[PDB]
Amino acid sequence: AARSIAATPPKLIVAISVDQFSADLFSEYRQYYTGGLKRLTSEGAVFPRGYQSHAATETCPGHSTILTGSRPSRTGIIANNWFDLDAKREDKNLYCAEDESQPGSSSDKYEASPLHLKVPTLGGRMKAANPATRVVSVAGKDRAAIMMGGATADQVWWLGGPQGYVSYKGVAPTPLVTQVNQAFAQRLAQPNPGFELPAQCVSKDFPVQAGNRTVGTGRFARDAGDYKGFRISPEQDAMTLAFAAAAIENMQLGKQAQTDIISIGLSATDYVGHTFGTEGTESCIQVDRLDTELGAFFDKLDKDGIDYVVVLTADHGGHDLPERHRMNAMPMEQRVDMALTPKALNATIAEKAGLPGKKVIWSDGPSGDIYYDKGLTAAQRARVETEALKYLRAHPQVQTVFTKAEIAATPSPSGPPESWSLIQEARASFYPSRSGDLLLLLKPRVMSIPEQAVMGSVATHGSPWDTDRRVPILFWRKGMQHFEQPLGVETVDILPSLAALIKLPVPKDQIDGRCLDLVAGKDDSC
Amino acid sequence: AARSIAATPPKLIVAISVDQFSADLFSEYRQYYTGGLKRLTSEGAVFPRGYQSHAATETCPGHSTILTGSRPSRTGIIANNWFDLDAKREDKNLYCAEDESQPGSSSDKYEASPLHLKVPTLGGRMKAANPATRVVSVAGKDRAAIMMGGATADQVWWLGGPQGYVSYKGVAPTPLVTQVNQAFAQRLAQPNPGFELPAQCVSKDFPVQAGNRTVGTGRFARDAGDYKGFRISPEQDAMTLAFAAAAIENMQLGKQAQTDIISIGLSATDYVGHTFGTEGTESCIQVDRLDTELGAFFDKLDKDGIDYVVVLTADHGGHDLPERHRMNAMPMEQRVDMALTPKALNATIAEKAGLPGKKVIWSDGPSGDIYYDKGLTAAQRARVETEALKYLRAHPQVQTVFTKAEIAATPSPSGPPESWSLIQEARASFYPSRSGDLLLLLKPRVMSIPEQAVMGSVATHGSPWDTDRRVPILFWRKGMQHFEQPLGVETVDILPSLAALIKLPVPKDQIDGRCLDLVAGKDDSC
Ligand SMILES: [Ca+2]
Ligand SMILES: [Ca+2]
Ligand SMILES: [Zn+2]
Ligand SMILES: [Zn+2]
Ligand SMILES: [Zn+2]
Ligand SMILES: [Zn+2]
């Protein structure tokens, strides 16, 4: 049994990103794991304080770091959406994982593509070193699959809707995929009675009102054919893992001479967290199912005799809805002023700049990147920068605003990510040609979803604060020596850590991360 | 069974401080608790990210916050030792828990006293409101017992050495105490074979060299009569808990009309952490024994039918020795330059100020408070401040140095403790008449114990960084509703939280902490 994680190159790397699986949520339920998460935390190399270190704590930037060893300042994936005011097409909003150069495309109707990603992934690097490498990537969300797989992946599949898993335009379903989609279709057509509460979820079972919604007691009961219900539930993760297992077996991943790699993006935790917040029965059930399904997944790989190493992490952390925080000893938790949402803020700034009724800024939400309209004249732009800063810095819920020049002037951060300044975090997701003219950051404990009568999502991530940056990073291979390392590491450290195990050279000057030693005690895998 | 923590006033408050039980160490072993810590974490109000929020993360300042609702800036307990250069006696170094006005006293031979503590404790406040209140405080260290009990406590006992538990000068052992000390004497006179490793400790069993010492594989085997061995082991915590249980029963605490309070300072985790670091078999065994002994302690109270509420926390966090960190993926971990220790630094600064061979500064260690010698003339003092700052700020291991005026100019901090600036942390343990003229803070991951041939302690706390500030805070009462709140709270919040349960008014302007709601969901104990 006892065997060093670096004894020989693993034959399969399994990289799992659990979307919105924050270190807080991970740590809370840690004492109840009995399945796959138990395996990882009791036997693996455990870094409970990993960091998606940059400020833009969203899915695309986060997934772009996991298998690239690169911060969003290098991957170019600085948000889920960014503005290119010089874009040919009408819609200046660009989706992180689209090819906007395609005719008749818009951010609402896009063609999936890894074109925006500026660097190779680990799979891309492995394939460059050895053409026989298979690189597979499956996920619940296109952006997760696409950013982990990279431009040279062999198979990139994601959940497209009620039809099941799909890929890039032109890519026909393989027999495995049609079989998976048949099973998915059969599961979807059946009602789901829901889940009774795990023992640990009983305490979380109370209703919380937020606008017209009540959350906190959901059990994922759903009607037949309810695709939205299926998506926002543990069912989609179970299906994604079954798909991954089927692909692993069908392609004989890890059964050939070279090392293969499969990346797996489990999206459910994130839909659940947005829809219900993170401390109710919904997230609790979801994490317990995650533990159980991961256990079954690992058991199947074991039974197949595959020599695999697993890394499991998240694309970012998350934060509970203010309404429940206020019931659980956090009375200062609040929702962002509606005055800071795109329409309102532009109108306000216009009127302050003396350009009332005009369009002087573009923004995507009540925080993050803000862009000055290109039409503005030099003097107009100057009045906009002055007035925007003056108004924002005076707002009670605003922590700070950085100018583009201030961020650019900041050196790429180094040292412990848990103690970075806000501008260092900003610099880590700064890419001059895509980033805003200003960066707006809200105070801690301000949720960037305004209070509304009719609400959709009640909770979100995307802030520069610790809840949203901190994520677990867990490495495991059969027989290795467990250790726990509570000091801060970055998700950009993942690539060089894995590369060391398979003796794949990676030029240090092409990445941001550093190699994490995965061998407890004297010997060093780096 | 089901019953709100605020349904009625508890009859007994049990406050437990586990010395150096950092949130990191607490979180690491959380999945293995089966005893008293399991009870607290699965059934209680769990705040896994509590903060000893100030910069001076030492035992005395930490214990001074737990039952006072007050930061060290208000308690006046700003360190374990501070200089009073105007003191009458020769030794200008004052111990936090002594009365230096006593003749022939020195910091090496002092008379224990709570005189330095500027504010009442919860016990003191309860007794002020109701004279029938019993206030008891027992600990492994005098400073823990003294600071949690306060000046009006009925019984304050601490481990004095091979003779067992002692109190203030003049206080005779009671029959209970002589009985406890008899049992302790019997335990001490027996060899201890040591402990075999709990399953979770097996992975930690490898040797680590630090100077002339090897740590990482200890099992607490000890010879008969080895008091040092007894002190640096789980044995002392077992004895302290048995003493507490015996006192509770003997005095019928919680069995009368009024609420009584007992504070318990379990010191072993801290001795073990200093002596061996925090990630080896020694700390692992110690935490497992802690869990088991706490379980037996709570079971005895339950069997006695006592209506008690428990709060459990730590006086500060802690940090592993650099030598093991470097083996476990933290290669940048290092020991502080010897040049920064008291003797050396003074000599250096003297020579830079043009007062070579003189005594221009006083300091206690390679970080923290520095004091200018009173003998210095205005101009001399000015050259010292200039040269000290210049030299320190240039040193590669120094994060920053604050002047006294800079800290004084800082308002008492508010808002989330996890995101305070360093000067805010400094302000939180700043007390003008006791604090230094300068405050020296080392960079993250610099251990403030220099590398030496012959070493004693290999690891310590006392830094302004997150490992040393972050501590668990756990509240429990039979039948309450469990909840977990991962956002940052302060240990100064403990007093008003407990006071709310027993309907004891506490003027907000006399404390720094705020009341934490301990009732999950809609109802609020505050
Ligand atoms: Ca409540
Ligand atoms: Ca090693
Ligand atoms: Zn995400
Ligand atoms: Zn999300
Ligand atoms: Zn201590
Ligand atoms: Zn200590």
XYZ file of C-alpha atoms in Angstrom, chain B residues 6-426:
421
model
C -31.619 31.488 24.846
C -34.782 29.793 26.164
C -33.820 30.535 29.776
C -30.651 31.686 31.554
C -28.095 28.870 31.895
C -27.131 28.077 35.501
C -23.438 27.638 34.713
C -21.149 29.259 32.164
C -18.098 27.137 31.362
C -15.457 29.104 29.497
C -12.574 27.110 28.103
C -9.420 28.594 26.619
C -7.232 26.065 24.847
C -3.824 27.729 24.709
C -2.476 27.970 21.120
C -5.427 25.980 19.696
C -5.267 27.826 16.372
C -8.071 27.733 13.827
C -5.608 25.967 11.496
C -4.932 23.156 14.000
C -8.610 23.019 15.005
C -9.691 22.787 11.330
C -7.114 20.170 10.397
C -8.269 17.567 12.942
C -11.937 18.477 12.920
C -12.902 15.431 10.848
C -11.480 13.101 13.509
C -13.145 14.456 16.651
C -15.363 11.899 18.378
C -15.561 13.314 21.918
C -16.046 16.775 23.420
C -14.876 18.654 20.344
C -17.302 16.612 18.238
C -20.140 17.717 20.504
C -19.176 21.370 20.096
C -18.660 21.307 16.324
C -21.689 19.205 15.327
C -24.257 20.633 17.771
C -23.016 24.095 18.690
C -22.778 27.626 17.343
C -19.579 27.299 15.335
C -17.416 30.311 14.409
C -14.356 28.649 12.805
C -12.863 32.027 11.918
C -12.675 33.836 15.234
C -9.934 36.419 15.775
C -7.685 37.398 18.583
C -7.813 40.539 16.491
C -4.871 42.586 17.821
C -1.267 42.332 16.684
C 0.207 41.065 19.970
C -0.821 37.412 19.564
C 0.552 36.228 22.931
C -1.042 34.406 25.886
C -1.627 37.308 28.280
C -3.181 39.769 25.798
C -5.250 36.896 24.379
C -6.611 35.669 27.698
C -7.340 39.283 28.666
C -9.871 39.524 25.793
C -11.815 36.319 26.322
C -14.015 37.217 29.271
C -13.694 41.011 29.203
C -15.194 41.940 25.835
C -12.186 44.219 25.632
C -9.179 44.467 23.343
C -5.712 44.771 24.831
C -5.904 48.502 23.995
C -8.557 48.620 26.738
C -7.432 45.817 29.109
C -3.920 47.266 29.168
C -2.468 43.776 28.748
C -0.447 44.493 25.622
C 2.124 41.671 25.867
C 3.385 38.905 28.149
C 6.099 41.352 29.244
C 6.467 45.109 28.761
C 9.039 47.661 29.905
C 8.342 50.349 32.448
C 11.600 52.273 32.237
C 10.333 54.497 35.082
C 9.829 51.563 37.463
C 11.214 51.965 40.973
C 12.855 48.539 41.102
C 15.948 47.547 39.116
C 14.198 45.170 36.685
C 12.355 47.432 34.240
C 10.765 44.394 32.629
C 7.234 43.822 33.948
C 5.414 40.503 33.777
C 1.794 40.874 32.600
C 0.384 39.157 35.706
C 2.573 40.480 38.529
C 2.425 43.289 41.074
C 5.819 44.917 40.546
C 5.288 47.270 43.508
C 6.142 44.399 45.875
C 9.603 44.659 47.499
C 12.423 42.482 46.206
C 10.287 41.453 43.252
C 11.612 41.036 39.717
C 10.120 39.669 36.496
C 11.996 36.434 37.249
C 10.603 36.214 40.785
C 7.231 37.918 40.913
C 4.046 37.972 42.961
C 1.031 36.906 40.902
C -1.679 39.577 40.724
C -4.481 40.765 38.434
C -3.518 44.387 39.242
C -2.444 45.182 35.633
C -5.873 44.316 34.190
C -7.798 47.576 33.670
C -11.321 46.172 33.160
C -13.698 43.733 34.873
C -14.242 40.212 33.579
C -17.637 38.608 32.966
C -17.362 36.972 36.379
C -16.611 40.399 37.867
C -19.643 41.876 36.139
C -21.900 38.992 37.219
C -20.774 39.313 40.819
C -21.355 43.076 40.680
C -24.961 42.404 39.613
C -25.448 39.489 42.038
C -23.121 38.891 45.045
C -24.147 35.213 45.290
C -22.313 34.480 42.030
C -19.329 32.155 42.324
C -16.431 32.964 39.995
C -13.832 30.234 39.610
C -10.795 30.100 37.353
C -8.331 27.220 36.985
C -5.501 26.861 34.468
C -2.099 25.414 33.680
C -0.599 28.915 33.621
C -1.008 31.665 36.186
C -1.592 34.380 33.554
C -4.476 32.397 31.972
C -6.277 31.772 35.257
C -5.691 35.315 36.526
C -6.798 37.168 33.373
C -9.983 35.093 32.885
C -10.999 35.287 36.549
C -10.294 38.971 37.268
C -9.759 40.773 40.573
C -12.994 39.645 42.271
C -12.904 35.928 41.470
C -13.588 33.599 44.425
C -11.073 30.909 43.436
C -8.086 31.314 41.125
C -5.815 28.303 40.791
C -2.945 27.430 38.491
C -0.232 24.810 38.134
C 2.712 26.055 40.201
C 5.202 23.252 39.594
C 5.781 19.742 41.018
C 3.752 20.756 44.093
C 0.607 21.058 41.981
C -2.002 23.792 41.945
C -1.452 27.020 43.875
C -3.063 30.452 44.147
C -2.147 33.977 45.221
C 0.156 34.567 48.185
C -1.730 33.996 51.441
C -4.297 31.612 49.980
C -4.213 28.235 51.714
C -5.069 25.036 49.832
C -8.663 24.011 50.465
C -9.494 20.338 51.127
C -10.478 19.992 47.466
C -7.134 21.430 46.374
C -5.058 19.212 48.664
C -7.031 16.228 47.340
C -6.429 17.300 43.727
C -2.727 17.872 44.475
C -2.493 14.442 46.100
C -3.877 12.854 42.908
C -1.528 14.966 40.818
C 1.402 13.920 42.998
C 0.440 10.263 42.496
C 0.188 10.693 38.725
C 3.547 12.486 38.534
C 5.350 9.788 40.515
C 4.322 7.176 37.902
C 6.163 6.659 34.598
C 4.049 7.287 31.498
C 4.643 4.692 28.739
C 3.485 7.246 26.173
C 0.674 7.080 23.621
C 0.470 4.965 20.487
C -0.574 7.040 17.465
C -4.221 7.735 16.652
C -4.948 6.676 13.042
C -4.758 10.306 11.893
C -1.348 10.825 13.558
C 0.388 7.988 11.651
C 1.030 10.187 8.609
C 2.743 12.796 10.828
C 5.313 10.368 12.210
C 8.645 11.478 10.754
C 11.651 13.205 12.341
C 12.517 16.837 11.666
C 15.853 18.364 12.726
C 16.060 21.900 14.120
C 19.426 22.815 15.589
C 20.464 20.146 18.077
C 16.886 18.907 18.328
C 14.766 16.339 16.528
C 10.973 16.620 16.671
C 7.989 15.068 14.905
C 7.860 11.570 16.408
C 7.366 12.200 20.133
C 4.751 10.193 22.029
C 4.961 11.738 25.526
C 6.718 8.836 27.202
C 8.229 10.215 30.411
C 10.149 9.128 33.487
C 8.659 9.194 36.963
C 9.021 12.614 38.596
C 9.728 14.331 35.266
C 7.743 17.521 35.838
C 8.886 19.163 32.605
C 7.692 16.090 30.710
C 4.373 16.190 32.547
C 3.880 19.899 31.816
C 4.671 19.517 28.121
C 2.060 16.818 27.556
C -1.658 15.956 27.558
C -1.324 14.908 31.203
C -1.596 18.475 32.490
C -4.823 19.158 30.573
C -6.384 15.937 31.922
C -5.476 17.082 35.434
C -6.774 20.616 34.910
C -10.124 19.287 33.630
C -10.379 16.823 36.548
C -9.689 19.733 38.917
C -12.399 21.850 37.215
C -14.912 18.983 37.421
C -14.073 18.399 41.094
C -14.459 22.130 41.845
C -17.775 22.284 39.980
C -19.123 19.392 42.054
C -17.608 20.469 45.388
C -18.964 24.011 45.143
C -22.247 22.975 43.551
C -21.624 25.412 40.694
C -24.775 25.750 38.605
C -26.846 24.142 41.358
C -28.033 27.333 43.048
C -30.445 30.157 42.211
C -27.943 32.358 40.403
C -25.686 31.694 37.431
C -22.135 30.707 38.367
C -19.087 30.838 36.093
C -15.924 28.759 35.769
C -13.064 29.570 33.390
C -10.599 26.836 32.480
C -7.226 27.406 30.830
C -5.862 24.272 29.164
C -2.201 25.051 28.596
C -0.759 21.859 27.106
C -1.437 22.612 23.437
C 0.802 25.664 23.744
C 3.777 23.981 25.458
C 3.563 21.180 22.872
C 3.373 23.629 19.967
C 6.408 25.604 21.157
C 8.453 22.528 21.967
C 7.653 20.427 18.907
C 5.866 22.613 16.378
C 2.297 21.952 15.374
C 2.154 19.326 12.603
C 3.961 16.345 14.155
C 2.750 13.423 16.258
C 3.021 15.470 19.443
C 0.347 18.069 18.593
C -1.723 15.392 16.883
C -1.777 13.171 19.986
C -2.406 16.216 22.178
C -5.481 17.350 20.174
C -6.928 13.837 20.141
C -6.496 13.572 23.924
C -8.044 17.030 24.283
C -11.117 15.794 22.367
C -11.329 12.657 24.568
C -10.806 14.436 27.905
C -13.303 17.207 27.027
C -15.829 14.493 26.184
C -15.426 12.869 29.598
C -15.610 16.292 31.256
C -18.884 17.228 29.513
C -20.333 13.762 30.235
C -19.707 14.242 33.965
C -21.490 17.623 33.955
C -24.384 16.048 32.022
C -24.652 13.148 34.462
C -24.788 15.687 37.288
C -27.779 17.357 35.620
C -26.099 20.761 35.281
C -27.694 23.321 32.964
C -24.507 24.763 31.475
C -23.449 26.713 28.427
C -19.893 26.229 27.133
C -17.762 28.594 25.139
C -14.443 27.253 23.880
C -11.740 29.320 22.209
C -8.011 30.031 22.155
C -5.809 32.895 23.325
C -4.102 32.976 19.902
C -3.202 30.789 16.932
C 0.168 29.320 16.089
C 2.565 28.368 13.356
C 4.674 25.290 12.591
C 8.488 25.304 12.690
C 10.072 26.471 9.399
C 12.123 23.272 9.030
C 8.979 21.164 8.551
C 7.242 23.825 6.486
C 10.178 23.626 4.081
C 9.564 19.878 3.722
C 5.846 20.366 3.130
C 5.708 22.773 0.203
C 6.654 26.018 1.991
C 10.354 26.465 0.988
C 10.300 30.205 1.768
C 9.695 29.589 5.478
C 12.655 30.892 7.458
C 13.977 31.865 10.884
C 14.537 35.469 11.931
C 18.012 36.984 11.545
C 19.903 36.855 14.848
C 20.833 40.479 14.129
C 17.289 41.471 15.177
C 17.362 39.975 18.694
C 17.587 42.472 21.631
C 21.346 42.590 22.339
C 22.380 42.712 18.686
C 19.779 45.218 17.528
C 20.603 47.640 20.331
C 24.324 47.403 19.568
C 23.666 47.996 15.875
C 21.371 50.980 16.456
C 23.749 52.490 18.997
C 26.645 52.393 16.527
C 24.424 53.910 13.831
C 23.294 56.712 16.144
C 26.884 57.466 17.087
C 26.483 56.129 20.619
C 28.504 52.909 20.222
C 28.639 50.554 23.199
C 25.767 52.397 24.854
C 22.240 51.267 25.657
C 19.852 53.164 23.379
C 16.926 50.739 23.085
C 15.161 48.066 25.088
C 13.353 45.143 23.481
C 11.995 41.752 24.493
C 12.457 39.836 21.242
C 13.153 40.150 17.487
C 9.765 41.820 17.009
C 7.114 43.773 18.888
C 7.575 46.739 21.218
C 10.855 48.673 21.252
C 11.533 51.335 23.902
C 13.971 54.252 23.805
C 16.196 54.551 26.862
C 15.033 57.401 29.115
C 18.601 58.636 29.546
C 18.732 59.751 25.919
C 18.603 63.481 25.237
C 16.072 64.928 22.788
C 18.594 65.082 19.933
C 19.917 61.619 20.794
C 16.394 60.204 20.832
C 15.733 61.785 17.439
C 18.822 60.185 15.907
C 17.756 56.851 17.413
C 14.258 57.009 15.942
C 15.696 57.964 12.555
C 18.416 55.296 12.506
C 16.256 52.499 13.950
C 13.608 53.091 11.287
C 16.199 53.335 8.529
C 17.932 50.091 9.530
C 14.760 48.103 10.274
C 12.866 49.155 7.150
C 15.887 48.140 5.073
C 16.077 44.671 6.638
C 14.826 41.950 4.249
C 12.790 40.128 6.927
C 11.060 43.237 8.262
C 7.540 43.958 7.062
C 7.175 47.364 8.669
C 7.825 49.533 11.696
C 5.242 51.831 13.253
C 6.034 54.767 15.496
C 4.031 55.270 18.676
C 2.489 58.435 17.235
C 1.375 56.624 14.094
C -0.443 53.969 16.132
C -1.970 56.502 18.549
C -3.251 58.449 15.538
C -5.139 55.365 14.381
C -8.778 55.119 15.463
C -9.822 51.991 17.373
C -10.655 49.552 14.541
C -14.121 48.350 13.558
C -15.457 46.218 10.700
C -14.437 42.623 9.722
C -11.283 41.595 11.603
C -10.116 39.303 8.761
C -9.448 42.407 6.625
C -7.850 44.800 9.106
C -4.645 46.552 8.114
C -1.494 45.926 10.168
C -1.713 49.330 11.839
C -5.317 48.567 12.828
C -4.121 45.343 14.445
C -1.366 47.360 16.153
